[PDB]
């Protein structure tokens, strides 16, 4: 199954957001990150990727397609707007083994407020 995540300058959650900010996919699913507005990209957050997973970083303005292979929770950010809180969470499969470790990862304050909300919406 294929899912879409859009990158916007303004959404229901405020400025510089990923929509949706939290998504549960299955092992092997594909998510396409699409900058609806210009100036955004997607990159994995340091310490918020499962064991076995490869980090990634898309180019600004590109539609980025990723097939998630290793199960667990992945923290993602927009490079330029990470300090402003532009972050999302992708859970791949059931019972993420790295769920406790991603909760402890350190992020700038606004990014931390949105990641905690997003982890809570997954039922974590
Ligand atoms: Cu951005």
Swiss-Prot record:
<keyword id="KW-0186">Copper</keyword>
<feature type="binding site">
    <location>
        <position position="78"/>
    </location>
    <ligand>
        <name>Cu cation</name>
    </ligand>
</feature>
<protein>
    <recommendedName>
        <fullName>Pseudoazurin</fullName>
    </recommendedName>
</protein>
<feature type="binding site">
    <location>
        <position position="86"/>
    </location>
    <ligand>
        <name>Cu cation</name>
    </ligand>
</feature>
<dbReference type="GO" id="GO:0005507">
    <property type="term" value="F:copper ion binding"/>
</dbReference>
<feature type="binding site">
    <location>
        <position position="40"/>
    </location>
    <ligand>
        <name>Cu cation</name>
    </ligand>
</feature>
<dbReference type="GO" id="GO:0009055">
    <property type="term" value="F:electron transfer activity"/>
</dbReference>
<keyword id="KW-0249">Electron transport</keyword>
<keyword id="KW-0479">Metal-binding</keyword>
<comment type="function">
    <text>This soluble electron transfer copper protein is required for the inactivation of copper-containing nitrite reductase in the presence of oxygen.</text>
</comment>
<dbReference type="GO" id="GO:0042597">
    <property type="term" value="C:periplasmic space"/>
</dbReference>
<keyword id="KW-0574">Periplasm</keyword>
<feature type="binding site">
    <location>
        <position position="81"/>
    </location>
    <ligand>
        <name>Cu cation</name>
    </ligand>
</feature>
<keyword id="KW-0813">Transport</keyword>
<keyword id="KW-0732">Signal</keyword>
<feature type="domain" description="Plastocyanin-like">
    <location>
        <begin position="5"/>
        <end position="93"/>
    </location>
</feature>
């Amino acid at each position: 199954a294929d899912f879409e995540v859009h990158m916007l300058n303004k959404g229901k959650d405020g400025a510089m957001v990923f929509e949706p900010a939290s998504l549960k996919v299955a092992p092997g699913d594909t998510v396409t990150f699409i900058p609806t507005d210009k100036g955004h990209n997607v990159e994995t957050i340091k310490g918020m990727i499962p064991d076995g997973a490869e980090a990634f970083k898309s180019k600004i303005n590109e539609n980025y397609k990723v097939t998630f292979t290793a199960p667990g929770v992945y923290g993602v950010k927009c490079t330029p707007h990470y300090g402003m809180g532009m972050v999302g969470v992708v859970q791949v499969g059931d019972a993420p083994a790295n769920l406790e470790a991603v909760k402890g990862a350190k992020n700038p304050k606004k990014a931390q407020e949105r990641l905690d909300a997003a982890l809570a919406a997954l039922g974590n």
